[model samples]
Target chain A: EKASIGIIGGSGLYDPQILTNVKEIKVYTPYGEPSDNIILGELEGRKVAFLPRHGRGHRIPPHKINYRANIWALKSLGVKWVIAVSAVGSLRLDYKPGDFVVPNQFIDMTKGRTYTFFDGPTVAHVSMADPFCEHLRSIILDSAKDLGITTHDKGTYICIEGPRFSTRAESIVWKEVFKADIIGMTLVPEVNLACEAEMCYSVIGMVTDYDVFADIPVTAEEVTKVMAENTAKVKKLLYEVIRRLPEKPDERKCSCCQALKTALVL
Target chain B: PKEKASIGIIGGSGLYDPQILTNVKEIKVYTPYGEPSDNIILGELEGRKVAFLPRHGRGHRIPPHKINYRANIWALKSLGVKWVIAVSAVGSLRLDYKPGDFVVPNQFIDMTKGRTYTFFDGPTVAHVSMADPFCEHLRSIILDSAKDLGITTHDKGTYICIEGPRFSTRAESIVWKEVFKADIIGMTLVPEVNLACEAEMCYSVIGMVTDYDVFADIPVTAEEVTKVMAENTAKVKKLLYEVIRRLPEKPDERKCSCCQALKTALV
Candidate 1:
């Protein structure tokens, strides 16, 4: 059978080294080239599709992802379920590095990223009451537990527009004032696009480090070291979830699927 | 000559339905920044040549925060409109100034985010007086005419403009009415007034009160604001029709100082 579940891996959580029968495939869309080619493979007797959220080698910055085309390519290729994996920094004192989480809510503290699907000739609005797919959330959470990963079930993921990380004062504001639990660069447009496609999506996130906020100052070396130790769990999660994904796209109960129905007219 | 229109109207809400225009030509004028919100409706009404633009576009698609303020003002200034009357809908901040009352405001408090409101770049700094922001003589004419036409009017008050596609939070609305000492609130006035000042056009606001904001607990729901706006719009339309009739015959020839608002001290 053709692939039913799509996997989008972000930032340091790049590549699907664990999938069996994996073959690299490139796809095209009207919006232009996707961030990178699609990676087609199988895990647990189920076919899977994967795309690196940023281009290969992390060439593009957070604000520069070709988000519209990335989502369009997956939907165009008959993808129904998506398990997106991102490497995040913990905002809460309790959420330390090596902990994995399935975040459901988002606060857009971002400034001006190219972030809409409505820019095309035809316009449509997508609903985002629950940005991630709830049904998929349970499946990923259970799978994370089975693998003995410490996965927080719920928290707010504050997505900031960044080619730059938060200044100490700014991060303090996001952590304390906004009550953000996870800090990440690229979780937002990916999830927003998935909601637009009406595809069931969930983020299987790995807390990589404390975003240079508390204790010792963080560097790319520290981020790389953390990924080296724990990046495998991301592959393990996507491998388990995508292989068990639904074969047919159901009429979703998620409000995200029918966002156009309640659009605000100016 | 391309049939220059010395007068123009920046049409606000309920003014989007442009059925009153004649010899209408749709003009898609491009600006240095981006596209204007809507096509310029070049037409004649009340026997005067006018260029009109619906600030929200005909379908009302652009949000206030996202509006290309620089482009909209620059395009009108480029088209030879010496003086522009900005007709807008606003919320009453005071108890005396009820819904449907009009004000020709003299002061503005700007609280918008990420909006670009200037045409100046490089070493060219222009400073014009905003101490008397509105065009005084033009405002007087508009106020007097509205009163003669049986419209409730407030002569002057501070207009607090906010950044919103969402309505104000209850707390912010309370702050507006109680703490900030505002008499009216609207979105487009500050940038519109500032940009027109930079462009050297004599700009005056004819502010129409829409509803008491949520702070008043006055049962002025969003639905009620929309309904009231629909009724108030006819009065705005009639006022514009009257202004257009008398305006062009004796247009202002005096050298106005609005063109130089930015060269003054900001520190």
Candidate 2:
């Protein structure tokens, strides 16, 4: 008996007050411990699950996240569609701070995170041409529009490896050259793992600031301030989306379940 | 005891032969990081002291992602080496940067994975500015040396370093060329350049183009890369020798910001 939707909160977001009858469950995966205890509960009168990308107290850095464990635990708990609520840096002028973007694509510039479960027993190359789940992305975009939130329907996100932020030079290249819309540290191995698990995944990126390309350098305090201001809007959107989620898992009409149909290399 | 050489040369791909150096003595030097890829060949060239290291070892055994960049750089640093000249064989990302052309890159975009690029990760944190990745003075000399030698050289370009034991796929290569607008692609310059900066040493790369990367109508192959390297090895070796010969007797003679890279960078 698990929820139909899983919400992963990043940075300032943690426990949502909307969750009632909440109980913390410790989940173990072969990969190791997740960021924190999985919080299982009911939201908007529907079953939902939550986990913090970083462990409690924000102890883990981006490059160090055990992404495999977190996703594995969620799958074991029977989550179908995953909503990754992340704090990102805007790489373009139009993607202002405090706006929301449901990215349709991503460019992975991360180094050395275990991104696949198909490592040994079998080899697989799941089609990354469409990395994000279109079925889930549509739901998020529609939900944002209904809520009258400032949301961009689709864009490409570039993932970087960091405990430190990008340098000015790196940021400019990502923006002007790559034509990327936003940047963040997580999302790579996370999205890849979800695809391998045959689970629908989509990111709900919250713009924190212009990365480093702006005249001023980004600071920790600045990211916190912007995220704090947008938290309420995000919570409302999440609640609405969960409430409208399919009641029966069979009613869902997404190819996410067949992600591994022809993905295996064996 | 043989004196430690202040000039270091890291040979990549087909540029492994160190017979150009006179009175060569092979010696193994261990660093706290780990063992370097191969023995340090201390030798003299053009009446100057130099150390030659084969990046992939003599037989080209270590893969790009598996290179011990930290150990290789640390070994050179510990030996009183103050200036490093890295020579690599790269695939051209743009048409103008054609095969057999030499490029002295000024900026680098790191797309590498699993490589450790810093020495100050834990007990202390440092963010050295990579605004100007290569040492300007060294780059200028390499550029000048090439010009004087009448070699086809592009003064400066952006080098995109990818994580590769294998070349880029057609899709990946096109994006690198079209979106990132990178001029060339290679695998080893990333942590090598970053580590050299952190170590406060003047470092520069001499990239010799091997083939048009996968962005071209036809994809590049291992056999093609090797063939190009074979054809261009003599030209690169000549340029390297000239660059080494023109180096100032003392490392401190060349004034640059590289030595002060750690200043105000520690957290």
Candidate 3:
């Protein structure tokens, strides 16, 4: 079987070390080049494809990620189920570092990034009532519990535009005022485009540290350390989830595959 | 070439009529960013040098989020516009701040996406303080002018700027109002406000309430906001005319923190 499940690795999870018989493949789309060449291989007896969201060695910043290209490339490769692995800073005290959160909602505060494939000539407004794929989320949640890794079933992820971390004022407002659970720089146009592509997508956010809201500003060293620890668990959880996935892509009962049917405005 | 004007007025929505000025001459000012939305008119108002630029251009052809805010702000800065009064149509998020009301928002919460919000990118990265995004000195003077005209005005409130070509979804509006606690909502304020700060210009927004945003039981249509905007244009014109008249004769004559915004900001 060809690679069907797509995994987008963020931060410390860039290299998919668990895959076997891997071959590097560079794919292009009308949008442009993806973050890097996607690694196609098999994991848990399932064909899987992986791409680093920030490119190899984490060269790309959040705002600069070619999200349209990345998602479009995955769709071009016949990828239907995508699990986006991202590192996030916790906005709430209870959502501690080293835990996984399957975000149910998102507030997009990103700036100046091309977020849609239907910019002109065609127009579409995909319903974002449930941004993430529920079916994919359920599988991840069940696999997390099976593996005994701590995971929050649902939370709101507020995505901010960043090359710079949030100011103290911004962090406090995002945490206390917006009541957001986790904060990250990506997951916007990525999630949005996945819907437009009619692919089942879910973000597996690894809580790395307390954001600036907690009077403790995030430092690069601390986030890297936490992500390093959580990355191991994410791999284990993904392997289990992949092993349990439906053999046939058509077996999916979720409406995510047909999302763009009613979403198109023109 | 005309002498560069120190006072700038950004006319938004239905408030682009600049016929009140004496000796009006349309000046096609171009900046490094790009051409401004429309031809900026330089003229005399109340014995002061003034410049007026339509934010959405001549026929309101440009949408709020699509406006070249960088170009617009840069054009003003290029022509020596030190004081900018941004007149915009806003949807009230609070009941007390009803339609026909004027709000001089002191704080800004940016929910805008995919717009160039800063001028100091890369070679120089500057984080100007937005603790009080609006200039208190400018807001006070505008408030005074509005009071003199007996226009119903609110002293200060938080304006949440959203990315919109399409208005907010019901869910978005509810969260913006209930969770973010936004008092008013509009589209063009974010990068405009941020860019003004980057340019070291004293900027203030005089928001004319056009309708109650979608959070209300009866949400406002685009047509309804346009109708309200038409009704409120004269008042906004009067208010802006008053604001420009009271401004300092020279940019240096003003003493405000906005002038020093870029002092410690560049990195």
Question: Which candidate has the highest lDDT of all?
Answer: 2
Ranking by DockQ: 2, 3, 1
Ordering by TM-score = 2, 3, 1
What digit string (tens of lDDT, one per residue) describes model 3 on residues B46-127?
A: 7777788889998889988778888999999888888888888899888899999999987777777667766654444444
Fnat across every predicted model, in order:
0.00, 0.16, 0.10
Range of the 10 consecutive residues with the lowest summed lDDT in candidate 2 chain A: A247-256
Model 1, span B51-82: residue lDDT tens:
88778787778777877788888888778887
Q: Candidate 3 on A1-266: residue-level lDDT in tens?
A: 25778999854443457678678899878878998998888877777788888787676666678899998888887888999998898988899989899989998877777788888777888877878888889999999998999999999999988644564556768878767899887898898888888888889999988886565456555676788887789978878888888854442445457777887776
Model 2, backbone clash pairs (residues 3+ apart or across chains), number: 0
Worst 10 residues of 3 chain A by lDDT: A247-256
- Candidate 1 clashing pairs, residues 3+ apart or interchain: A127-A259, B126-B262, B126-B263, B127-B260, B127-B261, B127-B262, B127-B263, B128-B260, B128-B261, B128-B262
DockQ-derived CAPRI band for the predicted complex in model 3: incorrect
Would you estimate the TM-scores of all the predictions? 0.50, 0.69, 0.61
Ten contiguous residues minimizing lDDT sum, candidate 1 chain A: A161-170
Q: How many backbone clashes does candidate 1 have?
A: 10
Give me the candidate number with maximum DockQ: 2
Chain A accuracy of model 3 expressed as TM-score: 0.93
